[PDB]
Amino acid sequence: KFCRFTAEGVQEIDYKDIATLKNYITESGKIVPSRITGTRAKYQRQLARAIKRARYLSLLPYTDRH
Amino acid sequence: RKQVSDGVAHIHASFNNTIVTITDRQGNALGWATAGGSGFRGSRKSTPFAAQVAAERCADAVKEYGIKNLEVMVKGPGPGRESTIRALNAAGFRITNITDVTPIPHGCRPPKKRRV
Amino acid sequence: PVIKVRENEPFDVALRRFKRSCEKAGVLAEVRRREFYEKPTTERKRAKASAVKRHAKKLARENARRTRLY
Amino acid sequence: SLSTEATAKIVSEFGRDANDTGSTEVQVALLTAQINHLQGHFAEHKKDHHSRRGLLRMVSQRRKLLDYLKRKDVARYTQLIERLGLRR
Amino acid sequence: MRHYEIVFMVHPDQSEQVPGMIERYTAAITGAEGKIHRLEDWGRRQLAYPINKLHKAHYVLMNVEAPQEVIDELETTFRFNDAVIRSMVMRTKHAVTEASPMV
RNA sequence: CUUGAGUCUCGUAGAGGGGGGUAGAAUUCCAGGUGUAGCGGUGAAAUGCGUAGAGAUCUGGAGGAAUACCGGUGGCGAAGGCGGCCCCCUGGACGAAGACUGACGCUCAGGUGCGAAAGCGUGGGGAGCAAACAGGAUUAGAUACCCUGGUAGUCCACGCCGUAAACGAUGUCGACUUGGAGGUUGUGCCGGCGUGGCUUCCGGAGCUAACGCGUUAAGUCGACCGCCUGGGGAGUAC
Ligand SMILES: [Mg+2]
Ligand SMILES: [Mg+2]
Ligand SMILES: [Mg+2]
Ligand SMILES: [Mg+2]
Ligand SMILES: [Mg+2]
Ligand SMILES: [Mg+2]
Ligand SMILES: [Mg+2]
Ligand SMILES: [Mg+2]
Ligand SMILES: [Mg+2]
Ligand SMILES: [Mg+2]
Ligand SMILES: [Mg+2]
Ligand SMILES: [Mg+2]
């Protein structure tokens, strides 16, 4: 648990921040549920938007079999 | 007749059958064997044992290329997933890596549910 | 679920590491879930039924802790 | 919705003070300004039923405010609907 | 004038045009009294997946405030420019004069 | 007159809606390479596909449709419904500090609009799926269930239809009446203590024929509307 975005007081999860985003996807590239990471509901949504937004720019992968 | 020493095994494990194709790293097939063509029909064909025999025959089919290391790419939900990888090791190949390449739509409408 | 076999690693445990990685990815369930079409009416009837049954077992467990069998 | 600029141009032009944002005249002029602006939106987006429902509430709200103004003092009512170019 | 964050990635073979295209886009925005709040050149990076068989691309990030009409010509210019293989224009609430987590 | 109703100012969350663009996965088709005897399917088979080289595997292309994970008795919408990402246009809700108008309200027969899916019209598109249809089985028979195919249709634009177990089987608005456990989204003060909105489960009095509902009432009341009067005939005939 212990959402790390309330803890760090983030205002937007900032898809360009690939260092953070890689902590919230699995080895195969799927978004990890807020139930597992204990992210708040509000930030989990912004996290999913940032991850999909980074996947489009090829900063992150969609799958592991590209 | 050529010597490669470095091939890729493609296990195609469906609910009804298992197909093992050993290709080189470039994706050109060297040989293949199936559970159905290994003397198994119907109920037998879709067992883990039928896939093991299929794996051994495919290893026996590519013996003239002298493959030494073998990547294993497993596809499908079939009962012949795990037992086919063991049989490749039992033959005497070196499994360098094992991957699941089962295609997942992120797609088309699937067929209707069977009312059995 | 890409497992690269490591040095001095026995085969079986790498085969154990592979079985783990595919289950954590839930690919086998994902394939079985996509083989027949599921109506939106039924996916919702199931989701709901899952939640209400997930809920009921929690309260049943909370309650059974305040009980004696003998 | 309308910009704060335009809202302030209406408040000052129709209210007797810049703080008189609640007078019937200001409200009717504010709704009329947004009703007229949306005519261009629905000339291109005829299949926008959800946004048109909010528009018809401005039409209904403005009608209820004019009917109130008419029976309280006609002098301000007739002076207002001519500035806004309303049939009634 | 609205705020926009533009991230466009360029073909690695025409990275030498990357310095050139920036001033042309800068001139177009600054021609229309638009500001440029940020402008970072990420250079060449490794792609997460192949894009038009490319494995690297030249990423350029800029934050601007322009009238929204001007951004359209940028979007049209990115569209017909075969140097640009992918782009993204996004509205931002305020000016973003900081530094990307990539620098 | 200001407490109901509304306006203005700052912000928040959201699959609210309409238009345009785009991405990745997968299916199918096409062309080619490697390769060779099966594939597929089932309870089991057969139809079917395959030596005219299938299936498997790799490469390039075309195309359409839907957006895995996130995803949640989570959110938004009057309801129907709404789910990749980006932009443009647009609706509503909520919250904080005031100011403003000055009860300006509620309900609403007739009227008006919106209204799943199927269906209809005109013009497109058509991958996958799939009524009809064809074949293979199963069976006493099997106008089915199962299998292999497969056309309307499903998709787009515009127009019509106007119905659903369109359901919370619970009309709308307002006031009042012990609690507990959550979710979600604001906000004030110092993880702690408040205060709002929406929402899920349990339960008290009360109510109910009972099941149950229970501050989101099916409790106590007020305002207005809709509707019922044994079953069938019949939501049928004219
Ligand atoms: Mg089938
Ligand atoms: Mg308003
Ligand atoms: Mg009526
Ligand atoms: Mg329809
Ligand atoms: Mg039609
Ligand atoms: Mg037609
Ligand atoms: Mg059929
Ligand atoms: Mg419904
Ligand atoms: Mg319902
Ligand atoms: Mg009824
Ligand atoms: Mg209860
Ligand atoms: Mg009738």
From TrEMBL, chain A:
Entry coiled-coil feature ranges: none
An annotated GO cellular component: cytosolic small ribosomal subunit
GO biological-process terms attached to the record: translation
UniProt-recorded Gene Ontology molecular function terms: small ribosomal subunit rRNA binding; structural constituent of ribosome
Lineage top rank: taxon: Bacteria
SUPFAM superfamilies: Ribosomal protein S18
UniProt key word Zinc-finger: no
Quaternary state and interactors: Part of the 30S ribosomal subunit. Forms a tight heterodimer with protein bS6.
Stored NCBIfam families: S18 (TIGR00165)
General function of this protein: Binds as a heterodimer with protein bS6 to the central domain of the 16S rRNA, where it helps stabilize the platform of the 30S subunit.
The name this protein goes by in its record: Small ribosomal subunit protein bS18
Organism: Escherichia coli (strain UMEA 3162-1)
UniProtKB/TrEMBL annotation, chain B:
Keywords of this entry: Ribonucleoprotein, Ribosomal protein, RNA-binding, rRNA-binding
An example Gene Ontology CC term for this record: cytosolic small ribosomal subunit
Gene Ontology BP annotations: ribosomal small subunit assembly; translation
InterPro entries for the chain: Ribosomal_uS11, Ribosomal_uS11_bac-type, Ribosomal_uS11_CS, Ribosomal_uS11_sf
A Pfam family that the UniProt record links to this protein: Ribosomal_S11
GO molecular function: rRNA binding; structural constituent of ribosome
Domain of life of the source: Bacteria
Gene3D superfamilies: Ribosomal protein S11
Family to which the UniProt record says this protein belongs: Belongs to the universal ribosomal protein uS11 family.
Function: Located on the platform of the 30S subunit, it bridges several disparate RNA helices of the 16S rRNA. Forms part of the Shine-Dalgarno cleft in the 70S ribosome.
Subunit structure: Part of the 30S ribosomal subunit. Interacts with proteins S7 and S18. Binds to IF-3.
Protein name: Small ribosomal subunit protein uS11
Gene: rpsK
TrEMBL record, chain C:
UniProt cross-references to InterPro entries, sorted A to Z: Ribosomal_bS21, Ribosomal_bS21_CS, Ribosomal_bS21_sf
Biased composition (Basic residues): 45-58
One Gene Ontology cellular component annotation held by this UniProt entry: ribonucleoprotein complex
Record-linked Gene3D superfamilies: Ribosomal protein S8 (1.20.5.1150)
Keywords linked to the UniProt accession: Ribonucleoprotein, Ribosomal protein
One Gene Ontology MF term: structural constituent of ribosome
Region of interest (Disordered), residue spans: 42-70
Biased composition (Basic and acidic residues): 59-70
GO biological process: translation
Family: Belongs to the bacterial ribosomal protein bS21 family.
HAMAP family reported for this sequence: Ribosomal_bS21
Protein name in UniProt: Small ribosomal subunit protein bS21
TrEMBL record, chain D:
UniProt superkingdom: Bacteria
Alphabetical list of CDD domains matching this protein: Ribosomal_S15p_S13e
Gene Ontology molecular function: rRNA binding; structural constituent of ribosome
Keyword RNA-binding among record annotations: yes
Chain segments annotated as coiled-coil in the UniProt record: none
GO biological process, one term: ribosomal small subunit assembly
PROSITE patterns named among the record's database cross-references: RIBOSOMAL_S15
A single Gene Ontology CC term: cytosolic small ribosomal subunit
Signal peptide positions (record): none
Keywords, alphabetical: Ribonucleoprotein, Ribosomal protein, RNA-binding, rRNA-binding
Matches recorded under InterPro entries: Ribosomal_uS15, Ribosomal_uS15_bac-type, uS15_NS1_RNA-bd_sf
Keyword rRNA-binding: yes
Function: Forms an intersubunit bridge (bridge B4) with the 23S rRNA of the 50S subunit in the ribosome.
PANTHER family assigned to the protein according to its UniProt record, in alphabetical order: RIBOSOMAL PROTEIN S15, BACTERIAL AND ORGANELLAR, SMALL RIBOSOMAL SUBUNIT PROTEIN US15M
Family, as annotated: Belongs to the universal ribosomal protein uS15 family.
UniProt subunit comment: Part of the 30S ribosomal subunit. Forms a bridge to the 50S subunit in the 70S ribosome, contacting the 23S rRNA.
Name the record gives this protein: Small ribosomal subunit protein uS15
Lineage: Bacteria, Pseudomonadati, Pseudomonadota, Gammaproteobacteria, Enterobacterales
Gene name of the encoded protein: rpsO
